[PDB]
């Protein structure tokens, strides 16, 4: 019942160098991890067949895009860890539909921006980790300051990698005037 690419513990499944997201994952596996995966993107509805996941981890992957509604069909997911990845693009609705998500980690992916309203609709979120990314502070990030001010979640300090004028400045400290636009 455990997928061939993955090795499965009782409640946990680890998939390494998987060429596709398995749709056969046994129920009563609440945690799934993808390490050094073969697949280059996460399309919409990839996890539809694994509704029981409370925890998801992506690490050491190279992704062209993580699509809108990629995580649709995961009503029970509390923890989502996307870390130490190469991600070229992240869609505004990528995380749409996770109401139960408590902890979200984008940390250490070297992401240059984030789209507006990417955190829209995640109510249960107590923690977001944006550290370890190279953020270009510009018009596309201007929303992020407003979100950091009004957010209920705990977010540790993050800094602008660019442009040269703003480098190594706390994004939380910035004001909307400084963003140009
Ligand atoms: C943070 O949460 C409290 C209670 O959960 C709420 O009253 C407050 O308005 C929230 N902050 C916002 C929405 O900026």
Swiss-Prot record:
It is found in: Secreted; Synapse; Cytoplasm. Oligomer. Interacts with KCNA1 within a complex containing KCNA1, KCNA4 and KCNAB1. Part of a complex containing ADAM22, DLG4/PSD95 and CACNG2 (stargazin). Can bind to ADAM11 and ADAM23. GO terms for molecular function: receptor ligand activity. Keywords: Cytoplasm, Endoplasmic reticulum, Glycoprotein, Golgi apparatus, Leucine-rich repeat, Repeat, Secreted, Signal, Synapse. It comes from the Eukaryota. GO terms for cellular component: axon initial segment; cytoplasm; dendrite; endoplasmic reticulum; extracellular space; glutamatergic synapse; Golgi apparatus; synaptic cleft. Residues 133-181 form the LRRCT domain. GO terms for biological process: axon guidance; neurotransmitter receptor localization to postsynaptic specialization membrane; positive regulation of cell growth; positive regulation of synaptic transmission. Regulates voltage-gated potassium channels assembled from KCNA1, KCNA4 and KCNAB1. It slows down channel inactivation by precluding channel closure mediated by the KCNAB1 subunit. Ligand for ADAM22 that positively regulates synaptic transmission mediated by AMPA-type glutamate receptors. Plays a role in suppressing the production of MMP1/3 through the phosphatidylinositol 3-kinase/ERK pathway. Glycans are attached at residue 152. The keyword Hydrolase does not apply. Expressed in the brain (at protein level). Expressed in cerebellar cortex basket cell terminals (at protein level). Highly expressed in the dentate gyrus and CA3 field of the hippocampus. This is Leucine-rich glioma-inactivated protein 1. It comes from Mus musculus. The chain holds residues 41 to 221 of 557 of the full protein. Residues 1-32 form the LRRNT domain. LRR repeats lie at residues 52-73, 76-97, 100-121. Its main location: secreted. Glycosylated.
């Amino acid at each position: 019942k455990c997928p061939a690419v993955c090795t499965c513990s009782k409640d946990n499944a680890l998939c390494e160098n998987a060429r596709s997201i398995p749709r056969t994952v046994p129920p009563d596996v609440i945690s799934l991890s993808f390490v050094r995966s073969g697949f280059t993107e996460i399309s919409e509805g990839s996890f539809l067949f694994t509704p029981s996941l409370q925890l998801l981890l992506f690490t050491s992957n190279s992704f062209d895009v993580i699509s809108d509604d990629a995580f649709i069909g995961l009503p029970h997911l509390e923890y989502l860890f996307i870390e130490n990845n190469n991600i070229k693009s992240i869609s505004r609705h990528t995380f749409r539909g996770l109401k139960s998500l408590i902890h979200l980690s984008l940390a250490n992916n070297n992401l240059q921006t984030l789209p507006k309203d990417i955190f829209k609709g995640l109510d249960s979120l107590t923690n977001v980790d944006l550290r370890g990314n190279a953020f270009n502070c510009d018009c596309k990030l201007k929303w992020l300051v407003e979100w950091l001010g009004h957010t209920n979640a705990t977010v540790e300090d993050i800094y602008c990698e660019g442009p040269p004028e703003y480098k190594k400045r706390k994004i939380n400290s910035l004001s909307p005037k400084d963003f140009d636009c």
